[PDB]
Design a protein around this ligand. Sequence first.
Ligand SMILES: O=c1oc2cc(O)ccc2c2oc3cc(O)ccc3c12
Length: 328
Amino acid sequence: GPVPSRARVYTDVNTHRPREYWDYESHVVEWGNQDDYQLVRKLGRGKYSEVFEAINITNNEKVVVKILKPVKKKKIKREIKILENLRGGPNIITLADIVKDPVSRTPALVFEHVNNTDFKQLYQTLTDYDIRFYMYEILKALDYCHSMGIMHRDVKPHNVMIDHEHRKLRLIDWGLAEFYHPGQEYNVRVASRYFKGPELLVDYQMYDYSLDMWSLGCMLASMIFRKEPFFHGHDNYDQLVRIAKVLGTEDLYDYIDKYNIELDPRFNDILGRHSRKRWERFVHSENQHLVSPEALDFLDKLLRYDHQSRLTAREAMEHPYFYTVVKD
Ligand SMILES: O=c1oc2cc(O)ccc2c2oc3cc(O)ccc3c12
């Protein structure tokens, strides 16, 4: 069968936590008062929730209310426990309250308000320094949740709220996040298509925190090369082919051979043979000001087939790419 895999960092953190910490099924939700919050306007509907801007009339402060769509109280408690565990951490969205919505008859998560401009216009105006700055901020968030035994599993521009004016950043939507337990097999149907790690695309279930680092690499590639998204697959199969046209097919086979994985035979007539490309290939006159040897080496160390070979969040923060970023 498939060769087992372990996270190379924070492997045993949940093993030595009290079971209270990771056993989210047994979590007892403490409900606030739903009348404290008045909905102002709808911000968006996802597959799992509707998101509203609201006001807490007990302090006249803006909040974000996420009213969950009906789903397993499995996944509801999971997001809630993860949010409470990570509360107070660097650039983690802050869960302020949990109330029961009288209309949906589902939980409504109440978050700190953060003032976001969309990633689409924002990513077109980001300077070289801005990209490095915000990447460092994301890494703080990723290193923290990983250190707390949690992988996000849905890292993408949509889930990174940026207040460009106050240069503040928040990682949001922890509804797909999970606890890492060594040797545990996970659902491969996570993350969004363009940001799915190769482990997901070859259906390798024993993944870990390193999944988040591939997704982050995809984001970085889209930013410094100014191509959103970078790997633009039409489906989950074409997605792996897109990646293979850059990282090459030989290292792809090295990867699945290492873990004794078999590709879906439908790849037989679409995968072909491809050499690994040098990242300079994607540099042109309109993005070159965002590119540096440091930028490419960092990107290169994130985008690895082998999840065990990618930089950890902590290692990433040690990278020379962030030397120019002013530290606090
Ligand atoms: O769309 C969202 O989905 C979320 C999901 C979460 O789990 C937590 C927070 C948010 C969240 O905060 C915001 C602030 C804004 O100014 C605009 C949109 C959002 C927004």
